[PDB]
Amino acid sequence: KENPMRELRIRKLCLNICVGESGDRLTRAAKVLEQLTGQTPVFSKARYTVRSFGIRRNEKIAVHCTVRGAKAEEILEKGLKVREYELRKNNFSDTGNFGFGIQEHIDLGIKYDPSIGIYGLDFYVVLGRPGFSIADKKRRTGCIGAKHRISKEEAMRWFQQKYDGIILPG
């Protein structure tokens, strides 16, 4: 038997376009995520000036957009075809969550433009359980207990069983 209150789902789909090319090439990156998500993103202002990379303190490096629920499933759905329904073992984190990276934004029903060009966006999947939203309230918060967590070994047999997507070695 199974307990469907231990059903595994996606809490949020965290997407970012890290360009490090502020002003012209960063404000046009917002058009990609609004096409992909259907909601307005928040810009990623830097922490300090690194000089080898070519960033500056509080300069807009990236732009991020977290999507939840119904829309979040569909955006993660089409990205897996572009990573041909297979992920490396070491893509999966210790704390249940995972992610991967498709190299070009053009593959997600997004047509080319001589000004838009060839962006790179990066997926990260936050795998959740009913009652993972205890530890972020203003009332009585607490750690979820080790019995209730999602492990890397279980986060495989979510993906390996749900999508029937293979997990390649090498």
Partner 1 sequence: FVKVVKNKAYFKRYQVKFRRRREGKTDYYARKRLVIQDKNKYNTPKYRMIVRVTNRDIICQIAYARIEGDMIVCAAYAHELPKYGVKVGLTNYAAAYCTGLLLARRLLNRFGMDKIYEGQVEVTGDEYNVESIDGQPGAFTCYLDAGLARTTTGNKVFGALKGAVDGGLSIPHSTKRFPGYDSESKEFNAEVHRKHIMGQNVADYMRYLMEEDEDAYKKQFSQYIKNNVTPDMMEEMYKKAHAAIRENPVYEKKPKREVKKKRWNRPKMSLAQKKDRVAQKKASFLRAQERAA
Partner RNA sequence: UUCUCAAACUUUAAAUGGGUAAGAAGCCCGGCUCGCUGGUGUGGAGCCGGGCGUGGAAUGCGAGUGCCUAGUGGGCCACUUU
Partner RNA sequence: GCUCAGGGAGGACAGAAACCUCCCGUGGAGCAGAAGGGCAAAAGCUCGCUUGAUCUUGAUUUUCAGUACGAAUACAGACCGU
Partner RNA sequence: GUCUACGGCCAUACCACCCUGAACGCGCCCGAUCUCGUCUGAUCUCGGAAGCUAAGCAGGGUCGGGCCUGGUUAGUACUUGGAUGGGAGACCGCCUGGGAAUACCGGGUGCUGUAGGCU
139-158 residues near partner 1, rule: CB under 8 A: 139-142
Contacting residue, 19, 30, 82, 167, with RNA by CB under 7 A: 19
Output 35 or 66, the one with its CB closest to RNA: 66
Output 1 or 138, the one with its CB closest to partner 1: 138
With beta carbons less than 8 A apart as the criterion, state whether 87 and 123 touch: no
- Residues in 151-170 at the binding interface with RNA, rule: CB under 7 A: none
Q: Which does 121 bind (CB under 5 to 8 A by kind): partner 1, RNA, none?
A: RNA
With beta carbons less than 8 A apart as the criterion, state whether 14 and 29 touch: no
Q: Could you say whether residue 51 binds partner 1 (CB under 8 A)? A: no
Q: Closest Cα to residue 31, out of 93, 98, 113, 99?
A: 113
Quick count: other Cβ atoms within 10 Å of Cβ 41?
20
Tokens standing for 126?
């936050």
Contacting residue, 2, 24, 52, 109, with RNA by CB under 7 A: 52
Output 50 or 135, the one with its CB closest to partner 1: 135
Rounded CA separation 51/43 (Å) = 21
Rounded CA separation 152/96 (Å) = 5
- Residues in 53-82 at the binding interface with RNA, rule: CB under 7 A: 53-55, 61-62, 64-69
Binding site for partner 1 (CB under 8 A): 137-142
